[PDB]
């Protein structure tokens, strides 16, 4: 209801979800350390308690061994990463 929805809003605002809070306020490009070691970069659109992150302008990178690892990197326009695969949520990246 109203108080509980406000409580989830506060969990997004002044909790450990402040990363996604900035990601949805200033639209900071977010690093998404996936559990498969896949690095995702893009602007966020939506957030959840379970760390479900909606993303935009998404780039996906992964180091493939053909050796010498090659950093493959491609684009998915929009993205959606429900809170299962995401290991770490980095608000500000170096790029």
């Amino acid at each position: 209801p109203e108080e509980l929805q406000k409580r989830e809003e506060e969990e997004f605002n002044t909790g450990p979800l402040s990363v996604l809070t900035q990601s949805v306020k200033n639209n900071t490009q977010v690093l998404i350390n996936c559990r498969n070691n896949k690095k995702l970069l893009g602007r966020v659109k939506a957030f959840d308690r379970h760390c479900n992150m909606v993303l935009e302008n998404v780039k996906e990178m992964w180091t493939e061994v053909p050796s010498k690892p090659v950093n493959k990197d491609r684009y998915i326009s929009k993205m959606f990463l429900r809170g299962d695969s995401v290991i770490v949520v980095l608000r500000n990246p170096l790029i």
């Binding site: 939506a46 479900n52 909606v54 929009k78 959606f80 990463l81 429900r82 299962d84």
Partner: protein
């Protein structure tokens, strides 16, 4: 607001899901539910180091799915 209705508000739109079993499935998924329960319909799925297998009725699991890819011309504000 969890992503339940953001995932469930979808039917038979050409999208690309990534199953956590290193595989991808693109197509018109039939219907999604609240706990990330989505089926596949006439979907083309590529596995880890494998072939472009075709599925006429495949039932994709929820936490075994690693990510989702929506259409490019869909307003995420109007979707989530």
């Amino acid at each position: 607001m969890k992503l339940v209705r953001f995932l469930m508000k979808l039917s038979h739109e050409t999208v690309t899901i990534e199953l956590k079993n290193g595989t991808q499935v693109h197509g018109t998924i039939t219907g999604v539910d609240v706990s990330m329960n989505t089926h596949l319909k006439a979907v083309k799925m590529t596995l880890k180091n494998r072939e472009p297998v075709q599925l006429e009725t495949l039932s994709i699991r929820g936490n075994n799915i690693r990510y989702f890819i929506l259409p490019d011309s869909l307003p995420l504000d109007t979707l989530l």
